[PDB]
Amino acid sequence: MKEFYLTVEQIGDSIFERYIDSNGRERTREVEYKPSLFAHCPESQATKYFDIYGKPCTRKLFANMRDASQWIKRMEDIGLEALGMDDFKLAYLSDTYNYEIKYDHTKIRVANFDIEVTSPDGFPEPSQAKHPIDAITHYDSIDDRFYVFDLLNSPYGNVEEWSIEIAAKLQEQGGDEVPSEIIDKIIYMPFDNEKELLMEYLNFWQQKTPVILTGWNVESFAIPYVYNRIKNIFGESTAKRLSPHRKTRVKVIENMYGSREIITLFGISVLDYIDLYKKFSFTNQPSYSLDYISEFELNVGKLKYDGPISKLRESNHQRYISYNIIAVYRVLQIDAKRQFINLSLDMGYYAKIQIQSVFSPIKTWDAIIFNSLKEQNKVIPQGRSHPVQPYPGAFVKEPIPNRYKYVMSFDLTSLYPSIIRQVNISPETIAGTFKVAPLHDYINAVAERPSDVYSCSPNGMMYYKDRDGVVPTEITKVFNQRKEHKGYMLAAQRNGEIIKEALHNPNLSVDEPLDVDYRFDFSDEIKEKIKKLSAKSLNEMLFRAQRTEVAGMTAQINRKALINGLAGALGNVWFRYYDLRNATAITTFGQMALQWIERKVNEYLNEVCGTEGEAFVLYGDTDSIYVSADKIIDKVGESKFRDTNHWVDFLDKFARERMEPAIDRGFREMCEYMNNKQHLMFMDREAIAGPPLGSKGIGGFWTGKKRYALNVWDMEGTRYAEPKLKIMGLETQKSSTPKAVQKALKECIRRMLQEGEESLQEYFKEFEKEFRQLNYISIASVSSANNIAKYDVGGFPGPKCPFHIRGILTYNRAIKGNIDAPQVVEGEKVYVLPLREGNPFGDKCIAWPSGTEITDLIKDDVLHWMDYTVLLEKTFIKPLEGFTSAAKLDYEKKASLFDMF
DNA sequence: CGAGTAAGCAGTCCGCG
DNA sequence: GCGGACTGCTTAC
Ligand SMILES: Nc1ccn([C@H]2C[C@H](O)[C@@H](COP(=O)(O)OP(=O)(O)OP(=O)(O)O)O2)c(=O)n1
Numbered sequence A: 001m002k003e004f005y006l007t008v009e010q011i012g013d014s015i016f017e018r019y020i021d022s023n024g025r026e027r028t029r030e031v032e033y034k035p036s037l038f039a040h041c042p043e044s045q046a047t048k049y050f051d052i053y054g055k056p057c058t059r060k061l062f063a064n065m066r067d068a069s070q071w072i073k074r075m076e077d078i079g080l081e082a083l084g085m086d087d088f089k090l091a092y093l094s095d096t097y098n099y100e101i102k103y104d105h106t107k108i109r110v111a112n113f114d115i116e117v118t119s120p121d122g123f124p125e126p127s128q129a130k131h132p133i134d135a136i137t138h139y140d141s142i143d144d145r146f147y148v149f150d151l152l153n154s155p156y157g158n159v160e161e162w163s164i165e166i167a168a169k170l171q172e173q174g175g176d177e178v179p180s181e182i183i184d185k186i187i188y189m190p191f192d193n194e195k196e197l198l199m200e201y202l203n204f205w206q207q208k209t210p211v212i213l214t215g216w217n218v219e220s221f222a223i224p225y226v227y228n229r230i231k232n233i234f235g236e237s238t239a240k241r242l243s244p245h246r247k248t249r250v251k252v253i254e255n256m257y258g259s260r261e262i263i264t265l266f267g268i269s270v271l272d273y274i275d276l277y278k279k280f281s282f283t284n285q286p287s288y289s290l291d292y293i294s295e296f297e298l299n300v301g302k303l304k305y306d307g308p309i310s311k312l313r314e315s316n317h318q319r320y321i322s323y324n325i326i327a328v329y330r331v332l333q334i335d336a337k338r339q340f341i342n343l344s345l346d347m348g349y350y351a352k353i354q355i356q357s358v359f360s361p362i363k364t365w366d367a368i369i370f371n372s373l374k375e376q377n378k379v380i381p382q383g384r385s386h387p388v389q390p391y392p393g394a395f396v397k398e399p400i401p402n403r404y405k406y407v408m409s410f411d412l413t414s415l416y417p418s419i420i421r422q423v424n425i426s427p428e429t430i431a432g433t434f435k436v437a438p439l440h441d442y443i444n445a446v447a448e449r450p451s452d453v454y455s456c457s458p459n460g461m462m463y464y465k466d467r468d469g470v471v472p473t474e475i476t477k478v479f480n481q482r483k484e485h486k487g488y489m490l491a492a493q494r495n496g497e498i499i500k501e502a503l504h505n506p507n508l509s510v511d512e513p514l515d516v517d518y519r520f521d522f523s524d525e526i527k528e529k530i531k532k533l534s535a536k537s538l539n540e541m542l543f544r545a546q547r548t549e550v551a552g553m554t555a556q557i558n559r560k561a562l563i564n565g566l567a568g569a570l571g572n573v574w575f576r577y578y579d580l581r582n583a584t585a586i587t588t589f590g591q592m593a594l595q596w597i598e599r600k601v602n603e604y605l606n607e608v609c610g611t612e613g614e615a616f617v618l619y620g621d622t623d624s625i626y627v628s629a630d631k632i633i634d635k636v637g638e639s640k641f642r643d644t645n646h647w648v649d650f651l652d653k654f655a656r657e658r659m660e661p662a663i664d665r666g667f668r669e670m671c672e673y674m675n676n677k678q679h680l681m682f683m684d685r686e687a688i689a690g691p692p693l694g695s696k697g698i699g700g701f702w703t704g705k706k707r708y709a710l711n712v713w714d715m716e717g718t719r720y721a722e723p724k725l726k727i728m729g730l731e732t733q734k735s736s737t738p739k740a741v742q743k744a745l746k747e748c749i750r751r752m753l754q755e756g757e758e759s760l761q762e763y764f765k766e767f768e769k770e771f772r773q774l775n776y777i778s779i780a781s782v783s784s785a786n787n788i789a790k791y792d793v794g795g796f797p798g799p800k801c802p803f804h805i806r807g808i809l810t811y812n813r814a815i816k817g818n819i820d821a822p823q824v825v826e827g828e829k830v831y832v833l834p835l836r837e838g839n840p841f842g843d844k845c846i847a848w849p850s851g852t853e854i855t856d857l858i859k860d861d862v863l864h865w866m867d868y869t870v871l872l873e874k875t876f877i878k879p880l881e882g883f884t885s886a887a888k889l890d891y892e893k894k895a896s897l898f899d900m901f
Numbered sequence B: 001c002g003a004g005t006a007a008g009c010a011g012t013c014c015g016c017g
Numbered sequence C: 001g002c003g004g005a006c007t008g009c010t011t012a013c
């Protein structure tokens, strides 16, 4: 096999590399890598090295990396550009792996671990590590084993061994329900004392040294805790055995309001799963506890126990250990679903970076572009200092708030990357500038043509047309990967819909799910067999289809995020290729494109309808248009349609055969107007939306910018078995909105769009009547909580104190003195409830950590004093009044003359 | 900690004769 | 009471 790196580090004048050799074995090596850097040189000096602008460079070969670094410093002191890859390990990878890397994930040791630490005096601070580590479960991907290290004797209690037999039994048998599929994969090791547990752990770790190290909050808790506890017991040298090169660094993570410490283990790639999830999931959750995320992703129930965690080991060590093992398995289950580890490896090996660098799009793109340029003997510029400056972004159309019955939406495929490629925007392709006219003048095609030579953006920038820039070249490569995966995602989605249809008629038989590739549209043969399958088999297929879709979603959306990140990286001062001219070339062209095509679409439809001055485009944001199709439907007449799917087809056909060619001609003209390199503005139909045929549903509504809802029948070519709501921006979509309120507001919207005013009034009346029975957590608002100290004045609210922060201060007073009550963590999320006038808490709200039950110390009082009236008005009635007045609808029945009867 | 900007709503403070 | 100036948070793209 071809060799691939596992990890790479610079330590002084050495590169330390762990790698898989040509025989599939793991090796480590120290290499005295001699880096090269570059300086500009005279034209008369023969070279093969050129900077990205075609200026000649001399290569400087250094005796060692320290010399290269010292040279960089002296080049600053002189005031001359020191060119080349200053991150020498990236240059090492580029030299050592001068090919497209094919990696074999079965050779990569992926470790998932979780530790337990009993603490009577509150949260066990990792930087102190003053309490014994009493459980470690460490799953190894190569062995496919859960290694359990269980402490039986502690200052906080002596316990009996954990029992695999009880662990396996049902909760209803008094067991822990550790999933049977992992029971045989558990290797249980009890220890008499913590010293021997830790010593054995380190020996195990040497034998099976993680390459990828993950788990839940491992970087902020488990790793620094284990490191510091071993440091405190045995000394630093022993603790540094967690690094295969025996090198570690305390790393200080700073943000706006404070800083925290992590432990960098040289020669390991830590990908904390909580951070993978935050970057890659495209969710915003009310809580990031593993219990909360597991329930959301996997539909598994919360891990249940009596009393606080601080007493669980002594009261129920059996459950304590089982829940430790289950917690490690839950992260593996999430990854089997989301496949974020697979994604990180793909992207990291593609870019040729330390895998953990996938968290930084700047670092990822710096390496991709470096490797691209190096291939052609080109030399990258030195990174420079830039002051942070604001710059303009997208255009968003102000919609007229209203109901909108029939809507067809369109938007650009990979808008910003397509702009980059079309215009040929790149550091080295800048050809110059032209005199800019007001944007409105380009939008209406009255401005002078910018250039007859170069490819232009309406911000004044001109680019070469003879050759593709490195940015368009590299962005195109990832875009193409994105498109392949999106194809698989969309096929799986359509396949899912076929299964749902077939579920309306399940067969009474015993059979199997069909062995199929859900990434490809089902053939007629498969479709036939599906119509003969049982509900059990169908549901299993649907589950598999949806997992396939999830896998496709992860691969496509995060590749989309990568290329979109390049567009934004051009507007970050830390990026090697920061340039506001290019960042704004993209965004300004985007604004033109939208408004240009709005004008074209209006012109086209006014034409087909024999009208003048009518607005058919009702809204748009960045790269999208929403087109009113009422007039198109009305031209055939609702009476001519057999059912909803009939007019959906008709609109689908109209969009495909009339709208899209019209849209395409409009953009081709714009491309010529701007003299662009290649026409790449492809604005495909997204959604077809309307009420069910013959209903009183209103179909859709807008309340304002970034606030709308649509009843959609077909999304990007997926024809749904049941209509699906596309809701954007509204309260149903905000993690801040109480869970039960999100649900009620969604059902209010479904009724509005699908059934009409009377159905909405019927539901509202019931919700208003019954909501006081809703569980307190389900009706609590949610907020991130920053600057709790800033607004704390003797435990009371200082001036301008935010409502949620006030709730926390109330909580803090109510639990004061308790070393045991859960603390609110600065920067994390809280539930918030309003309190009735004259409550014992002495303020108008209380807040506590989200994803948790409020401590029993105060729970009864909170429940008794919860202000349901304020809660209802603020979270439910106010947003609903906003939806209904926008939609010209009443959520309560108004009096009429009929009431005389 | 980790690419970008646009823009919505909640809440505080306070004006508005 | 409502809105503007401002802070805080959250979402659409
Ligand atoms: N998370 C996001 C979403 C969008 N955008 C910017 C870049 C996108 O290109 C543009 C349009 O947003 P879309 O959500 O429509 O994304 P794309 O057009 O890139 O992809 P798709 O092909 O799925 O429409 O807005 C961004 O910077 N970051």
Ligand SMILES: [Ca+2]
Residues within 6 Å of the ligand: A115, A116, A324, A327
């Ligand atoms: Ca735990």
Ligand SMILES: [Ca+2]
Residues within 6 Å of the ligand: A411, A412, A413, A414, A415, A623
């Ligand atoms: Ca788009």
Ligand SMILES: [Ca+2]
Residues within 6 Å of the ligand: A411, A412, A413, A684, A685, A686, A716
């Ligand atoms: Ca599309």
Ligand SMILES: [Ca+2]
Residues within 6 Å of the ligand: A502, A505, A506, A507, A530, A531, A532, A533
């Ligand atoms: Ca059937």
Ligand SMILES: [Ca+2]
Residues within 6 Å of the ligand: A411, A412, A621, A622, A623, A624
């Ligand atoms: Ca869009």
